[model samples]
Target: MNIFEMLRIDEGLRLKIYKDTEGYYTIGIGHLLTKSPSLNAAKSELDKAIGRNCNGVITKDEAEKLFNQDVDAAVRGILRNAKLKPVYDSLDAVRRCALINMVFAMGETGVAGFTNSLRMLQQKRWDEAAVNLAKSRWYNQTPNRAKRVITTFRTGTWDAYKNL
Candidate 1:
């Protein structure tokens, strides 16, 4: 998956902040909490500060930076090596983004679990792919997202969520 696609899939165009499932403050494309200018817990050893938030939360610029960094890291590091990379690479942009969207929601291994769905995707069997996608626990868990993905696969549009 490409970095920009990953960002759009993971964070969309959200420039504002939000909380994640664990209730941790998150911004950008799935960057976990951390501080800029480097924070360290090393005061006990020699001399250093534990670092604290001196001001408000991250700026939009900071969030965007985090997003780019995260997207680059995930796409280049983990998603690039996903088990279905070859199949993913072979798809059209929208279809590829659909799968990448799945990978972002479910991890690479979790996405790999959709063996039949992946095969259908590889074969360009859109109907079969949509059916296989719908008949999964993943779909039940997140029907809205699943529908968006299914619609993308079926219609070849990246913004299938809008149609729903």
Candidate 2:
């Protein structure tokens, strides 16, 4: 499955602005407004597409487009991080999807905080990486999504998409 296909389910299809699990400003399928490339541009585009301020509602089409942008931005953010680029490039497609998921949920910095997990992932120690990931606030606080990611790390397979 494509990364966005899985994320479209894992992250809800919200229209209006809301706080994500980490309390950051977000909208449109977990797009982090506060952590975007440019707040002004994001907000401008959002307002134009949705026809209202950040507080107003949006359609599924608009939301889908926003989600696409967010996912691409997350990938760009991950690739741009010098500390994460090599580690990211060494992974296979499935594992790369897993990293994008984490980056989508949090940010590059947030995933970078996973020192032991990253080390284990870089070394291709799947089980150890999953174990390291499991023992964290990211795992404890967001168990469902975290479980999916951890399992991906362990097996290098994305969870099957729902009805897709």
Q: Best TM-score goes to which candidate?
A: 2
- Model 2 lDDT, full chain set: 0.79
- Candidate 1 lDDT over 134-157, as tens digits, reads 998878866776787798898787
Q: What count of clashes does model 2 give? A: 0
Give the TM-score comparing model 2 with the true structure, all chains together: 0.82
Backbone atom clashes (below 3 Å) for every candidate: 0, 0
Top candidate when judged by lDDT against the true structure: 2
Residues 46-164, model 2: lDDT tens digits: 67656667535677888888887888899999889986787899999998988988988878898898888898899999888888898998789989778887887789865444333
TM-score of 1: 0.66
Worst 10 residues of 2 by lDDT: 34-43
The per-residue C-alpha lDDT of model 1 at residue 127 equals: 91
State the displacement of the C-alpha of residue 50, model 1, in Å, after optimal TM-score superposition.
14
- Work out candidate 1's RMSD over C-alphas: 6.6
TM-score of each predicted structure versus truth: 0.66, 0.82
Residue 48, candidate 2: how far off, in angstroms?
Answer: 7.4
**Cα RMSD for candidate 2?**
4.1
